Design a protein around this ligand. Structure first.
Ligand code: SAH
Length: 313
């Protein structure tokens, strides 16, 4: 029978999308999240999946037992300590666990607790720090990953006391392959004041580029350090526009900066770069800002999918 998957801290459902891509015999029995905005997006894309809009800390052991899950997929931002407290009390321990977190987690106290708990329960595990660029995706998103399997023999690729920086046994695609034809360029052009203020601090990429900076939840609202911006103007070079800036009045610098036709990648384009399927979308009521915020909290579906494949077989 198919594995019963519990999806905690579900968000827009990146774990569920990764589960479907992995092709393994499994189905999400319960997705859990308190955020009503994330949940409307999740339900919209996964209308037949049980979604529990509840605090994870408030879920009792009985509720977890009734779910009878064989795999936990989670991206914890208390609720986490509760999960750890619940594990040794479950009538049926899940055979699989996959956790995603941020760089630095691998040295944290919380991580030390997680590993102690899972080791005490008989799980073989391996930690990783992976970015989508390792899979030929032109977008950086270095994240922590822990895969664990309930068995006696170590995973074949195990490296004790080490965090693996690559997938166990790239040719990067261009950004053009992830752009949407129907993108309303004018709508996404960076505004004048933002161009001038952040002019020298932008990471400008062209469609033929095979890299882009990590997108944060603030992308599209805050300029600096939140993700690359796209040059849509052809037959103009960034270098020539920037050379022209010294000695021009601020209004003149803006005129020059607008020529590059720099625009934000759209929420759908970020979802594409994150590996979300073609049909993935958002309800009309979800604002562009909410879309960027939700995607910023999500994960790269392709990376997790490959890790699920590794963990399962
Ligand atoms: N105590 C808690 N109970 C339930 N959900 C929680 C929670 N604390 C955080 N969350 C949710 O966990 C998420 C952390 S972001 C995880 C996003 C998800 N991996 C994705 O594919 O979108 C947020 O959606 C947040 O609302």
């Amino acid at each position: 029978e198919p594995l019963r998957v519990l999806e905690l801290y579900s968000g827009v459902g990146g774990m569920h999308h990764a589960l479907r891509e992995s092709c393994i015999p499994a189905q999400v029995v319960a997705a859990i999240d308190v955020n009503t905005v994330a949940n409307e997006v999740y339900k919209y894309n996964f209308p037949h999946t049980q979604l529990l809009a509840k605090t994870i800390e408030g879920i009792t052991l009985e509720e977890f037992d009734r779910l009878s899950f064989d795999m936990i997929l989670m991206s914890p931002p208390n609720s986490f300590l509760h999960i750890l407290d619940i594990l040794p009390r479950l009538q049926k321990l899940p055979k699989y666990i996959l956790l995603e977190n941020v760089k630095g987690f691998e040295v944290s106290s919380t991580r030390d607790l997680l590993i102690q708990t899972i080791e005490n329960c008989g799980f073989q595990y391996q930690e990783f720090l992976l970015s989508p660029t390792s899979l030929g995706i032109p977008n950086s998103r270095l994240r922590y990953f822990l895969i664990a399997k309930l068995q006696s023999e170590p995973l074949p690729f195990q490296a004790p006391g080490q965090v693996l920086m690559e997938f166990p046994k790239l040719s990067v695609k261009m950004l053009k392959d992830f752009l949407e034809d129907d993108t309303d360029v004018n709508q996404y052009l960076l505004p004048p004041k933002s161009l001038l203020r952040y002019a020298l601090l932008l990471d400008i990429v062209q469609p033929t580029c095979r890299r882009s900076v990590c997108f944060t939840k603030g992308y599209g609202s805050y300029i600096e350090g939140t993700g690359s911006v796209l040059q849509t103007a052809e037959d103009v070079q960034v270098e020539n526009i920037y050379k022209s800036l010294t000695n021009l009045s601020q209004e003149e610098q803006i005129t020059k900066l607008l020529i590059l036709k720099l625009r934000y990648f759209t929420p759908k384009e970020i979802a594409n770069l994150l590996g979300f399927p073609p049909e993935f979308g958002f309800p009309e009521k979800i604002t562009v800002k909410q879309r960027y915020r939700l995607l910023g909290n999500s994960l790269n579906v392709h990376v997790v999918a490959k890790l699920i494949k590794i963990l399962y077989e």
